[PDB]
Amino acid sequence: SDRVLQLKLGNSSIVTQEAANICCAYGEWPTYLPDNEAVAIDKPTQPETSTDRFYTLKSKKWESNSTGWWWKLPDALNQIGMFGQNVQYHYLYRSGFLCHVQCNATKFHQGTLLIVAIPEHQIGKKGTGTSASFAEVMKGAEGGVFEQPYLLDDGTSLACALVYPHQWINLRTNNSATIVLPWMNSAPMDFALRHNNWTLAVIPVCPLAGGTGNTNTYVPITISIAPMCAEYNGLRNAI
Amino acid sequence: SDRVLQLKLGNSSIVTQEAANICCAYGEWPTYLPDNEAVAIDKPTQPETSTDRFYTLKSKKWESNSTGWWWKLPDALNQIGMFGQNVQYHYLYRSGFLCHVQCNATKFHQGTLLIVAIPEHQIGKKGTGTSASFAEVMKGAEGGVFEQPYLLDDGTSLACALVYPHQWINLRTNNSATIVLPWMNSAPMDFALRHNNWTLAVIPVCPLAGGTGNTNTYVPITISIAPMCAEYNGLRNAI
Amino acid sequence: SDRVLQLKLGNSSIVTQEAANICCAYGEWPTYLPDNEAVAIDKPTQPETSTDRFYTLKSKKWESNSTGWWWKLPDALNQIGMFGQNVQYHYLYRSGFLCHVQCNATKFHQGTLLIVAIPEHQIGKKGTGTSASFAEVMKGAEGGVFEQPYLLDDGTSLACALVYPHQWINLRTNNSATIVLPWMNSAPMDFALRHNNWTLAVIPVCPLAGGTGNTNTYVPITISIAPMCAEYNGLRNAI
Amino acid sequence: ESMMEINNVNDASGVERLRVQISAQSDMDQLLFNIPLDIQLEGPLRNTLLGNISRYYTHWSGSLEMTFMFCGSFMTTGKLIICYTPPGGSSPTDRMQAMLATHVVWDFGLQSSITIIIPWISGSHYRMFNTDAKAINANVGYVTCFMQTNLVAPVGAADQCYIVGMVAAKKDFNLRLMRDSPDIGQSAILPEQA
Amino acid sequence: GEIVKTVANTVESEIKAELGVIPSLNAVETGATSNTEPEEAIQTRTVINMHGTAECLVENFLGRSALVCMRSFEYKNHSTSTSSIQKNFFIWTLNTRELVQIRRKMELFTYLRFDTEITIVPTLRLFSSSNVSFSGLPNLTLQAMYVPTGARKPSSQDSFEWQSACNPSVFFKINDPPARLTIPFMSINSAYANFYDGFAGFEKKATVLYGINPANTMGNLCLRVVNSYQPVQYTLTVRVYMKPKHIKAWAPRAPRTMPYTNILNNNYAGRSAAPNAPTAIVSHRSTIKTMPNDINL
Amino acid sequence: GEIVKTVANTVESEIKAELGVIPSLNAVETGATSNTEPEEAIQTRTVINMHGTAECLVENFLGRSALVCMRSFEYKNHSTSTSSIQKNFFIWTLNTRELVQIRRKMELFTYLRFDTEITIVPTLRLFSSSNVSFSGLPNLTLQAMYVPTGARKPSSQDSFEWQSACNPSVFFKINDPPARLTIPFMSINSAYANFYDGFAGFEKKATVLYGINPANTMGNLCLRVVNSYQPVQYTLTVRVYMKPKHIKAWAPRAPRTMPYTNILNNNYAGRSAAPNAPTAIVSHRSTIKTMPNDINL
Amino acid sequence: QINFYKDSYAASASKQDFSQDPSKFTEPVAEALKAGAPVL
Amino acid sequence: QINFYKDSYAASASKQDFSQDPSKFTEPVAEALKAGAPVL
Ligand SMILES: Cc1cc(CCCCCCCOc2ccc(C3=NCCO3)cc2)on1
Numbered sequence A, B, C: 001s002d003r004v005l006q007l008k009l010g011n012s013s014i015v016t017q018e019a020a021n022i023c024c025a026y027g028e029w030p031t032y033l034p035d036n037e038a039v040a041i042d043k044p045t046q047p048e049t050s051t052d053r054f055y056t057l058k059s060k061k062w063e064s065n066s067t068g069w070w071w072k073l074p075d076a077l078n079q080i081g082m083f084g085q086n087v088q089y090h091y092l093y094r095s096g097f098l099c100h101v102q103c104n105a106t107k108f109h110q111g112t113l114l115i116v117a118i119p120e121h122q123i124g125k126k127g128t129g130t131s132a133s134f135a136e137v138m139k140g141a142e143g144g145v146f147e148q149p150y151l152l153d154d155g156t157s158l159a160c161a162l163v164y165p166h167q168w169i170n171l172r173t174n175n176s177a178t179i180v181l182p183w184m185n186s187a188p189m190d191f192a193l194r195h196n197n198w199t200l201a202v203i204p205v206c207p208l209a210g211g212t213g214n215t216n217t218y219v220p221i222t223i224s225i226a227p228m229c230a231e232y233n234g235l236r237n238a239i
Numbered sequence D: 001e002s003m004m005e006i007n008n009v010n011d012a013s014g015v016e017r018l019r020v021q022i023s024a025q026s027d028m029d030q031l032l033f034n035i036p037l038d039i040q041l042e043g044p045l046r047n048t049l050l051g052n053i054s055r056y057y058t059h060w061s062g063s064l065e066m067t068f069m070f071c072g073s074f075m076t077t078g079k080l081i082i083c084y085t086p087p088g089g090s091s092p093t094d095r096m097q098a099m100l101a102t103h104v105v106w107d108f109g110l111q112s113s114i115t116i117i118i119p120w121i122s123g124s125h126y127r128m129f130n131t132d133a134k135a136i137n138a139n140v141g142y143v144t145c146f147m148q149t150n151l152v153a154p155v156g157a158a159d160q161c162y163i164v165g166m167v168a169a170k171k172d173f174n175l176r177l178m179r180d181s182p183d184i185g186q187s188a189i190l191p192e193q194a
Numbered sequence E, F: 001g002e003i004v005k006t007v008a009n010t011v012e013s014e015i016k017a018e019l020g021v022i023p024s025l026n027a028v029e030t031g032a033t034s035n036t037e038p039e040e041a042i043q044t045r046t047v048i049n050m051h052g053t054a055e056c057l058v059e060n061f062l063g064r065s066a067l068v069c070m071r072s073f074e075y076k077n078h079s080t081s082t083s084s085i086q087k088n089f090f091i092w093t094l095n096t097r098e099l100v101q102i103r104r105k106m107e108l109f110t111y112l113r114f115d116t117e118i119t120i121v122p123t124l125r126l127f128s129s130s131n132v133s134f135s136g137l138p139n140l141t142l143q144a145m146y147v148p149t150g151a152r153k154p155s156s157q158d159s160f161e162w163q164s165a166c167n168p169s170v171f172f173k174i175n176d177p178p179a180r181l182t183i184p185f186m187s188i189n190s191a192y193a194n195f196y197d198g199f200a201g202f203e204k205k206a207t208v209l210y211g212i213n214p215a216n217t218m219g220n221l222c223l224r225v226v227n228s229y230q231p232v233q234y235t236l237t238v239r240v241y242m243k244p245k246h247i248k249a250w251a252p253r254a255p256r257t258m259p260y261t262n263i264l265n266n267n268y269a270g271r272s273a274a275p276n277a278p279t280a281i282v283s284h285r286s287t288i289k290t291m292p293n294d295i296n297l
Numbered sequence G, H: 001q002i003n004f005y006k007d008s009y010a011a012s013a014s015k016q017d018f019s020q021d022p023s024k025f026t027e028p029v030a031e032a033l034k035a036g037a038p039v040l
C-alpha cells in the first residue's frame, strides 16, 4: 500500500502517482443484481469489456474565480460508446460508477478541490418558483456549472456536503481523486433518459494561486468515469 | 417430433407450422470460441440476449419471372440493432447464423424455392473482366438479385448447388425453411465491413403459378436471421 | 386421444370428427344427489335410459347478420319425451346437461361461433324498466334470439363472457362443440316450470362468409341436449 | 381468457369491435393494428376480466399474455408478427423498428391461435393505474401487429379474414390497493321504477 | 388445488429450437386458457417473488364495509286535525342493490355465502325554517328493529309493534358510536343468489315479476326515533353499511358494464355516448392503427 | 457493525513520546474522518459512561407525531340559484412537504421506509356574522376517505363517491377522540425518495416538471362533513398528524438551510440578511479574531 | 379470529386460505392438455 | 411491540436496535487506515 494506484478496467488503465486512497461510497463495491432482488424477468445483457471501461470527459480549466462543475450520471455517459448504445437500445439499466478526477499543478501552486458524489441530487434554482428545465438539468458529458457552490444549488450547505462520498484534491499532496459508487435507487433499475442517480461535483474550496511567476497558469481538470457491473433490460429500438 | 417447430432466441420467437426439419450446416451447431483456438488476447464481449435474436429483413415479392435473391452475412445485419452496433464498435467478430425463410401460399398455388447457404461465395460477373464493385457486392439488408441463378453468379452450376447446406420450400408441403450455420472462416475472427462468410440465396426453381383464379397473387418472401454465439474483440470508435 | 369423439348415452350416440375436446363446466361431472345433501325424504325416481339421452332441438340457419340464439334449460327439454313427462308429473328435479352444438361448413367458409353456458342467466331488456314477460323468457325448445349479443342481454359484456364454460366452433378446425354442465343451484332441487339453471347461448363472433361461389350458403346450427343423472321428487298429477 | 375491443373506432357497432380486419395486402411490411396497454384509461384492455378486476386495484405487477385467434377459411394461409415494445419512445410504425423489441412470428395452420407473453419489464416492483398513462409509473409499453409475408386465400375462399384478440394474466400477477372502480357510477338512490 | 402464498417464480432458460414442441401455439377452441409459460416463450432469467396474494382473496375483496342504505326522514309533529300518526320512522324492505358499487361487487359472483356485519350511522340536522335558531343537536335515542318476513310492520312512531319481544332490535344514540351487529347467513338455500333466472311464484300472471328470487325475501328494517316529537323540526339521515365475512363465492360472473336503472331487475338504458354506450362500451379512437396516447419526441 | 448500548468509555493514558506514531496528524484528503482518539491525543483518565443512546436512534428521531396537513373550510349552505353543489368537503392531494419542520426531517435522509400512523384532529367554530349567537358546538360526523391514484374524486358533499365500498374511510365525531389509523409502506419502490433527480414522465415537454417522482403519486384524502348543512354557518379546521414507524433510513443528506418556497420543488429565495442569507448562512461577527460572546471581567 | 361472543359466526374475518385452483376455470377440459405439445 | 391487530405493520414502534456502523460514513476507504500510523 502506498500513494500510487492503478485502475485497470477492460482496455482502459489509469495510473496515478500522487493519490490518497480509494473512496468506496458507503463502504460498498458495485455488484451485479441478484435473483432475490431482480424484478425484470427477461435476461439482462452484461457486456463486460465493451461497457465497463473508463470514458474520459471533456476538461474544464480551473480559474481563480471558478465556482465548480457537476456531471450527472449516467447522463454524462449516455451519449458515449457501448454504454450509451446499450442505454439507447434498452429501457432498464443498472451500473455503478468509478469516478477519477485529474488535476495537475506544480509544487509552487496552491488550491483545493472537493469532489463530492451527491446521490439523488435535485437541483433547486434560486429566486424563482419555476422548476429547472430539461435543458438546464440534462447536460450530458459537457457538464454543468454551479451558480451557488456555497449552497450546492440545492438550498443546502456546502459545509455539510461531507455526508456524501467525497475526495479532496489538495495540490500539496494530491493530483487525482477516486470515488467508487454502487447502485443508488429505491428500485433495482430505472430509465436513463429521465433520471440520474449520482451527481459528481467538483467545487474549488480554495482558489488556484501562484506566486509572481505562476499566476494565470492554465490548469485543466479531467473527469474519467467507468461504469461497473452494467446490466440492461428491455431491448427495443433506439430513442 | 413433427412438422411444427418453435425457434425461441432472446426476445424473439418464431413459430412455424408447415415446416420440414432443421438443417444444421455440415452437422454442426454454432459455439463460442474455445481457448485453444483463440487468437486475440483481450476478452471478447458476449451480449447474449441483445444480439442473439431474430432480425427480420425486408421482404421480396415472388414473381413468375423472379430469378432469385441473395443476402450476404453479416452484411445484412451489420446495420441493425445491437449486432450492428457491436460490429461498428469492434474490429473482430465471430457468430453463427440461424436463417429462417417465410413464404406463404394457398394449397392451389404451385412453386418451389431452393434456399442455399453458400460459404465464401465469390460473385463472378459475366461478360466483363472487371471485378465486382463495392456497391454491387456489399448490399446490406436490402439484398441482391441474381443475374444468372442458373450459374449462381459464380460460373458454377445451380444443379450442383446441393453440396451447400440447403432447404426446399415446396408449396405443397412447406411454407418455411430453417438453416443453421456455424462459423465459416480459415481464421477464428475477421473484419465485417470487408468480408462475408455466408451467402443465403433463395432461387425459384419452379415458378409461382395458379389456376384461373390465383394468377398474379402477391406472395412475399421474408428472411429472418438470428446471430448465435456472437463474440466481438478490439473495442474502438465507430466507423 | 384425438379430434374424434363419441358420446353414447342411452339409445343415443353422437359421433363427431372435427371436434376439439370436452369442456366440463368448472371441472366437474354431473352426479346423483348424495344423502348428506338431500332434502326431500321420499325416494326420487331415477329413469336412466328413458331420460338420460340426447334430444335434438330444431335447427337455426346461420346468417351473415345473425346476432345469436339462446336456449334455457331445462325449459328446452320440458316439453320433450320422458324428461318432459317426468318434469310435468313431479315437483322437484335435478339433472346435469351435456350440450352438443353442430355446425357444418366447407373448408372455403369462414366463421366463428362462441357457445357459452351462462348459469343463472337473468335476461335484462334494454330501454325499459319493465321486467321481461313470461312469454319472452320461457321459450321452450324453440329458443330465443339475442337483441344485444354484445351485451349478452344482461348489461354485461360479451368480451368478459369467458368466465362461463364455453366452446368455440371455428370453421377452420371445428364443426361441433361439447360442454358438460353439472347441477347449478343454491338448492338441491327446484321447480322446472318457474326457474332455469343454465342458458346455452350461441353467438356468432365472426360472420359466416364465402368467396365468390360460397355466399348465401344455407348452413344450419343444431343443438342436442342430453340430461344426465336426472332425479325427480314429489309425484303428482300433470300441470 | 377475455376478448378485448381492438376495433374501438367510431365505425364499429357492437361485436365488430371484438374482431379485427385482416386483409390480403398489395404491399409488404405494413402495420395491421396497434394495442395500447393502458388498463386505467379508455382502451381495448379495460373491458376485460383482467382489466375490470385490476381496475378495482391501484398497483399491479407481473407478466401478461395475449392470444390471437385466426378466423379465416381453412385454405387461407398467412404470416404475422406480433411485437411488444417496452416504453420510452414512440410507437413503431415500420417492421424495421418493431422487430427489435419483443416479438413472435405467427404462422397459420392447424393451431389457429398464437400466444405472446408481455413480460414484466419494469424498474419498480409495481405499476400504477394512473390517469396519466404517459407517466413512467403507469406506461406499460406498446403492442403492434405487422404482416410478415402476406395473407393468401384462394378464389373460392373469402379474401378478408378476421383476428380475435384476447388478454389474460399469468401465474406471477399481483394486485394491491383496491379502490372504488370508475367503471360504474350513480347519481341518486336506485328506485323501484324507471 | 395448491396453496399460493406468493406468486409463481421465474426460472432461467436457454435457446430452445426443438421439432414438435410449440408452446406458443394454442387451441383456444377447446375452451382452455393458453398455458404458454413466459419461461420458454421468451428468454428469461431467475426471479424470486416475495409478493403476497392475501389482498387478492375474496375474503379481502368483499369483506370490506360498504354503504347499502341511506334513508332521510323528517322528525317533527306530523299530527293534523285528525291524523293520530307521528310517522317519525322508516322501513327499508331489506335488499342490497340500491348502491351501485356494492351491487356490482355482489354481482361479480353468481353465488355468495357470508355472515354480514351491519353498522348504522345516524346524523342530525335542523330544517331551515323562517325563524330557526341552532345552538346544538339533541342526543336522541333511535331503535332499529329487524322485522322478518310475515311479521307485523309498525305504522307509526307510537305504534305497539316496537315492543321487540321477539324481533331483534338495537337502541343507540346520536352521540354514541355507530351501532354495530351481525346477521348470520340467513338464506333458506345454501347461498345467496345475485341472479335468479326464473319466477318467485307458481303463477303465470304478469304480476309475478321475472328475476325475483323466492329466497331474497330478506324482510324489513324498521328504524324509529324513540324520543317523541320536538317543538322544532329536525331531519335524521341514517346510513347502513354492510360488511361480508366468512365469504365463499361460486361461479364468477361477467362484470356489469352498464349503469343500473332500478333494483327490481338488471335492465339498462345505456349512456348516450361511449364509453359504456349501448353499441360502444369502450370509447372510440381514431383508427385501429393510431395510438391515442402516443409519446412523441 | 457493533451494538452500542452506551457511548464509548475512556481509558487512562500516560506520557507518549514515540517516533513514527502521529495520532493527531490525519489525511482528510482520503475522505476519511479523523480517527484521533481523545485517550492518546491528550492526557486522560478512566471514565465509565452509562449514558444511553436510545433517543438518538432514527426510530426515535423520526417516530414522533408531526403535523403534515391543516385544511379549513366553510360548513354552510353553498347552494345558489342554480348550484346543486354543497361543497362541504376538501381534498388534500396527499403529500408531506407543506409543513417545514416535518419536511426538513424527511429530507435529512435520501431514502426512508416506514409505516405511518395518521391522526386526524377536527375543530369547529362559528363564523362571526352580523347576527350570530353561540351557546354550543354540534357533534358533527366527519368521513375521511383515502382515494388512491386513478380513482374517482368526489365533487360535492352529496356526491355518491362517498360509498367507500373499496376506498378505506373512517367516520368520527368532533367530541370523540381524534381519529387514528395506520398506512403501511405503500411505495411501488423499496423506499420513499425525498429527492428525485429526474422527470416522472417519458415526455420531453415543459409540462413534465423536474424533480417530480413517479413514485410519489400518493393519492388523495377526501374529507367531508357527513351531516348536511346547518341553518347557520360553521367553519371546520382539520389537522392531520403523521407518525413514522418501523423506519429504515438510507444515505443521509445535507441539512436544508434555506426556507422552502413551495412543495413542488426545492427552490429557494433566501432571506434578506444573515443568518440563512444567500451569501451568508451564519450571521456576521466583527472579525475572525473578535469573540461575539466574550466573558469580560 | 378471536370471537369474543358465543356464536361462531360473530367472529372476525376468517383465517386466510390461499388454496388456488385456477384450472377449473382455465383448463376445464376432460382430456388434460400437456404443455409444450400440440393440443389440437 | 404488542400488535393487537392482525397486520404486523399495525404494531407499535419497532424493538430497539443499537447496531452502529459509522465506518461506512467515517472510513469509507478501500485500504483501512490504521490508527496511530501515517495515513498518507
Ligand atoms: C344477494 C343477496 C345477499 C343478501 C344478504 C342481505 C343481508 C344484508 C343486508 C343488510 C342487513 O340489514 C340489516 C340491518 C339491521 C339489522 C338489525 N337486526 C336487529 C336490529 O337491526 C338487520 C339487518 O341478500 N341477497
Ligand SMILES: Cc1cc(CCCCCCCOc2ccc(C3=NCCO3)cc2)on1
Residues within 6 Å of the ligand: F068, F094, F095, F096, F106, F112, F116, F118, F144, F145, F146, F168, F169, F170, F181, F183, F192, F193, F194, F216, F218, F221, F240, F242
Ligand atoms: C417521501 C415520502 C414519504 C411519503 C409517505 C406519505 C404517507 C403519509 C402521508 C399522510 C397520510 O395521509 C392519510 C390520511 C388518512 C388516510 C386514511 N385512509 C383511510 C381513511 O383515511 C390515509 C392517508 O411519501 N413520500
